[PDB]
Design a protein around this ligand. Sequence first.
Ligand SMILES: [N+]
Lengths: 9, 140
Amino acid sequence: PSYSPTSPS
Amino acid sequence: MEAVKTFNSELYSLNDYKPPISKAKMTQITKAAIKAIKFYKHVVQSVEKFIQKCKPEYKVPGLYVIDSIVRQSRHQFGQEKDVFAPRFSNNIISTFQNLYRCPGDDKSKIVRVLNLWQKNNVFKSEIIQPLLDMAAALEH
Ligand SMILES: [N+]
């Protein structure tokens, strides 16, 4: 799994 | 500054991975930033320096670092108490000038982040608009 700016904190 | 050195280590460790950067790695970098909150100015400086100096394929990861730190700080300390977005805002034109030295196909990823910052009020709209304008001007 790679970082997305749409993913919650 | 122990906490700052620890953050520097996590941030520079991006160079040991092929992008796209994992969620796990981004979380590690973010946690180190937050632990170093007393030295938030040094954290911002290190991120900006990374973005200035890194290889083109790490520009978008560098932006994701800003995104992750700012969003985590807003969550953990409160939107109005977050020290990171205001601090990143100071040199943000410089930062984006450096960011846009990314590979051509990465430009859309930068704009995606900007649009989310606007939609979610992560940064003030007055700050974001010139950054979007810079993206568009590059296409002309
Ligand atoms: N903060």
